[PDB]
Design a protein around this ligand. Structure first.
Ligand SMILES: *[C@@H]1O[C@H](CO)[C@@H](O)[C@H](O)[C@H]1NC(C)=O
Ligand SMILES: *[C@@H]1O[C@H](CO)[C@@H](O)[C@H](O)[C@H]1NC(C)=O
Ligand SMILES: *[C@@H]1O[C@H](CO)[C@@H](O)[C@H](O)[C@H]1NC(C)=O
Lengths: 49, 49
């Protein structure tokens, strides 16, 4: 998802579904790789719990 | 068929599977029928809720 080799053109933006798995954000919100992470209806701190 | 093995080839169950919102497959195993006694020998039961 974040590390994909190629990403979609926004005119044809990919909409992928995720389930049956655990949502660990620790290598995500806590990680240097992004110049923006904004959440909009949760605290990002809460995404584990 | 010459290998001294049993091997699946026929899989006629659907022509399409459009929208798969859940999927699972177990860890693999080698299915066979082995060991004999001549009377009707095994009861199997399932409950589905
Ligand atoms: C992407 O995956 C690599 C390992 O394949 C990891 O080192 C890196 O931190 C990951 N980056 C993100 C943003 O998840
Ligand atoms: C024997 O097994 C191989 C793969 O292990 C398969 O390609 C081949 O078709 C099989 N032969 C027969 C006669 O079933
Ligand atoms: C389910 O299939 C219909 C018809 O192909 C499609 O319009 C819809 O977007 C699909 N939904 C998902 C989640 O794949």
């Amino acid at each position: 998802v974040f590390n994909a080799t190629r990403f979609a053109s926004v005119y044809a933006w990919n909409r992928k579904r995720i389930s049956n798995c655990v949502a660990d954000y620790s290598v995500l919100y806590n990680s240097a790789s992004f110049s923006t992470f904004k959440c909009y209806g949760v605290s990002p701190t809460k995404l584990n719990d | 068929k010459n290998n001294k093995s049993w091997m699946e080839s026929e899989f006629r169950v659907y022509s399409s599977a459009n929208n798969c919102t859940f999927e699972y497959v177990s860890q693999p195993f080698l299915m066979d029928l082995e060991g004999k006694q001549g009377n009707f020998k095994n009861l199997s039961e399932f409950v589905f809720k």
